[PDB]
């Protein structure tokens, strides 16, 4: 028996444009999923799916390799499902987050959300992937 814990960071930044875009978009924002502190999550992460509001074109954005991030311009905040799929050949194959992509009016915004995943009795190949990315076997 064996249990592994590994950390992901979800974040975004948002800046109020000095000049809005032609469509009237007031902000530049960027959303990402990364490993903390030098850790590389590509070892166990197969792809990240960012589901953008359907006002955006091709709202289902996919990154299959780092950096796992979406850069965009818009005018309001919105709820953004985020799927992180794993390099696993058994369940669980993905985790889903509900991310609040919010913009403020005062100008500069940075947000960071620290998530912790636990995998119970992973295969030994997947376990190696987890640890190479900064994971932790536990009680």
């Amino acid at each position: 028996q064996c249990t592994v814990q590994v950390r992901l960071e979800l974040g975004h930044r948002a800046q109020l444009r000095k000049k809005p875009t032609t469509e009237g978009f007031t902000h530049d924002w960027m959303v990402f999923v990364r490993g903390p502190e030098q850790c590389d999550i590509q070892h166990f992460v197969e792809k990240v799916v960012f589901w953008l509001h359907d006002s955006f074109p091709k709202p289902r954005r996919v990154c299959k390799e780092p950096p796992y991030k979406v850069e965009e311009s818009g005018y309001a905040g919105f709820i953004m499902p985020i799927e992180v799929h794993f390099k696993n050949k058994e369940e669980p194959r993905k985790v889903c987050f509900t991310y609040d992509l919010f913009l403020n009016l005062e100008g500069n915004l940075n947000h960071l959300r620290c998530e912790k995943l636990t995998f119970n009795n992973p295969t030994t190949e997947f376990r190696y992937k987890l640890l190479r990315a900064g994971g932790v076997m536990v009680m």
Binding site: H53, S55, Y75, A76, G77, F78, F102, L103, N104, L105
Partner: peptide, 4 residues
Amino acid sequence: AARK
């Protein structure tokens, strides 16, 4: 803050 604006929302959609």
